Amino acid sequence: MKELKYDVLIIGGGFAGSSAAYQLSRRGLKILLVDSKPWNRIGDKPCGDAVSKAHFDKLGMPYPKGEELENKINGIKLYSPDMQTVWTVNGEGFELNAPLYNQRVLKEAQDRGVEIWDLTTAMKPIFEDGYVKGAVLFNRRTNEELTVYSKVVVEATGYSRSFRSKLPPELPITEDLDDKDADVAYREVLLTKEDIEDHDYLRIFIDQETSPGGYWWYLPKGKNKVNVGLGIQGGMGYPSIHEYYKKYLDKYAPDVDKSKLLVKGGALVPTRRPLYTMAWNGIIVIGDSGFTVNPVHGGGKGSAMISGYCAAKAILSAFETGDFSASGLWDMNICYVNEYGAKQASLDIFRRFLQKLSNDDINYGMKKKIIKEEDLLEASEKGDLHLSVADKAMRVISGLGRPSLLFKLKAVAESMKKIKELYLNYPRSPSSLGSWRREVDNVLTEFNKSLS
Numbered sequence: 001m002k003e004l005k006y007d008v009l010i011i012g013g014g015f016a017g018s019s020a021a022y023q024l025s026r027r028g029l030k031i032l033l034v035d036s037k038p039w040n041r042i043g044d045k046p047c048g049d050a051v052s053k054a055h056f057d058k059l060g061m062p063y064p065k066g067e068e069l070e071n072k073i074n075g076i077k078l079y080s081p082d083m084q085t086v087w088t089v090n091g092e093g094f095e096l097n098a099p100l101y102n103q104r105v106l107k108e109a110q111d112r113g114v115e116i117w118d119l120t121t122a123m124k125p126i127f128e129d130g131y132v133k134g135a136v137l138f139n140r141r142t143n144e145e146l147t148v149y150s151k152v153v154v155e156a157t158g159y160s161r162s163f164r165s166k167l168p169p170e171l172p173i174t175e176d177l178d179d180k181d182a183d184v185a186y187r188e189v190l191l192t193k194e195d196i197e198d199h200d201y202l203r204i205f206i207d208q209e210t211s212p213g214g215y216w217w218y219l220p221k222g223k224n225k226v227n228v229g230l231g232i233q234g235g236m237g238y239p240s241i242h243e244y245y246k247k248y249l250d251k252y253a254p255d256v257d258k259s260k261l262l263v264k265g266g267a268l269v270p271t272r273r274p275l276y277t278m279a280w281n282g283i284i285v286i287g288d289s290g291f292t293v294n295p296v297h298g299g300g301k302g303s304a305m306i307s308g309y310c311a312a313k314a315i316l317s318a319f320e321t322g323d324f325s326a327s328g329l330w331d332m333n334i335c336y337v338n339e340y341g342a343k344q345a346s347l348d349i350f351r352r353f354l355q356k357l358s359n360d361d362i363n364y365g366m367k368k369k370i371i372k373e374e375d376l377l378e379a380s381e382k383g384d385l386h387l388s389v390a391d392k393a394m395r396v397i398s399g400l401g402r403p404s405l406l407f408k409l410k411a412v413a414e415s416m417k418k419i420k421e422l423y424l425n426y427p428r429s430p431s432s433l434g435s436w437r438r439e440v441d442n443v444l445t446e447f448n449k450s451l452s
């Protein structure tokens with residue numbers, strides 16, 4: 001078959017892959033990005049399409065404009081299980097036309113010298129001499145089966161992780177996903193009968209009975225259009241997620257016109273700390289494939305862009321040293337951990353605590369204001385549950401006369417703080433990975449026991 005040589009092969013053109021291509025462009029490298037979807041459909045994986053504005057500023061990413069920006073978001077309304085307590089959390093964000101924005105990032109990267117093949121699937125990894133050295137591609141637009149060699153492969157294949165899973169199991173980069181460390185999520189976009197009240201605000205509903213292990217959402221895409229859906233924790237034996245959706249849709253969305261459905265469907269969402277290493281010999285993994293999703297609120301498009309940024313930085317460093325080993329790409333880990341990874345680890349622990357709380361706990365905690373909306377933001381943006389904040393909450397929880405998991409909040413804050421310092425002390429070299437990884441596992445396995 002035909003053989004081609006590139007500096008970098010990016011597999012997948014989602015928020016992760018496209019950002020990697022964008023950040024790597026016009027810097028002296030020959031880059032190819034492939035995606036199985038046709039161009040017009042790239043980026044249409046079922047999503048809430050809600051991204052914070054702060055993510056776009058930090059990375060120097062182009063703002064969504066025009067048709068790409070469907071609705072401006074100014075805050076979030078968080079509802080308690082009994083619908084009695086509503087927390088308001090302010091912050092600027094965007095409700096996106098995800099495919100339109102994604103395709104512009106790709107189009108601009110293409111204008112900056114990056115080559116993009118749509119309708120192309122990476123079938124087989126080229127793994128020779130202990131290194132990832134490229135892939136076998138199938139371009140069905142030209143019906144060609146091409147062999148592409150690269151110094152670095154960027155695996156950004158989404159939740160399917162369809163490429164790195166085909167690599168030898170001895171590689172740390174093939175770390176798989178535990179069922180309980182993910183949520184199955186489903187959404188629909190419909191037009192509403194009446195105009196949406198406070199359409200610049202997102203609505204998040206917490207209820208362990210209508211969406212166990214996750215939550216329901218009501219995300220306005222306009223004055224008369226809304227993205228409504230839910231997520232539940234996997235590997236718990238719960239029935240099909242569509243059963244939850246059909247049963248409780250009217251409770252959270254009574255205003256939608258069910259005869260005006262635009263899109264529907266669901267997918268898997270990682271809800272854990274990232275891959276213990278997102279880099280190895282000749283390969284970097286980003287996005288959902290590298291578990292870059294926020295463990296608490298399940299947002300992963302902003303962090304996907306972050307992972308793409310770090311992927312670009314690490315690759316450029318590798319070429320300046322002629323080192324494409326794990327050691328030569330190790331800055332990928334250091335960058336992402338500081339940027340988002342350390343937060344994920346802390347939030348991984350906090351998630352496990354939150355998912356085990358009852359509706360009574362959540363109703364009590366929100367009505368009695370154990371933590372402020374302000375001090376909640378700090379938890380979901382820096383991953384920090386300050387020991388002073390936890391103490392303040394524990395004084396309120398002390399007024400509860402019934403048994404509850406809430407009494408362990410201080411211990412949770414200490415565990416979050418512990419694993420945070422552990423990730424900030426991420427190994428400087430690949431030779432310290434195994435030791436560091438086992439220490440992380442010990443923190444988690446210990447924590448899981450403390451919640452019982």
Ligand SMILES: Cc1cc2c(cc1C)N(C[C@H](O)[C@H](O)[C@H](O)COP(=O)(O)OP(=O)(O)OC[C@H]1O[C@@H](n3cnc4c(N)ncnc43)[C@H](O)[C@@H]1O)c1[nH]c(=O)[nH]c(=O)c1N2
Nearest residue numbers: 012014015016035036047048049050122158287288300301
């Ligand atoms: C229902 C639901 C709702 C939400 C969310 C998820 C889900 C399922 N998320 C999470 C967010 O959607 C997700 O984390 C990111 O889109 C992940 O971006 P990636 O590019 O890594 O994956 P993504 O799946 O977008 O990219 C994978 C791409 O790789 C391609 N590909 C796969 N295998 C391939 C192969 N072998 N060869 C070639 N191409 C291949 C696919 O075709 C696809 O284009 C979210 N996040 C957020 O920020 N806010 C929100 O509101 C939500 N809400």
Ligand SMILES: CC(C)=CCC/C(C)=C/CC/C(C)=C/CC/C(C)=C/COP(=O)(O)OP(=O)(O)O
Nearest residue numbers: 048050051052054090091092093094297298299
């Ligand atoms: C539905 C699933 C699975 C995930 C959704 C993920 C979420 C909740 C995304 C919301 C992103 C968004 C549009 C946020 C805007 C509102 C907000 C509180 C943003 C906070 O971000 P910043 O803008 O940095 O906050 P500041 O106001 O402090 O600057």
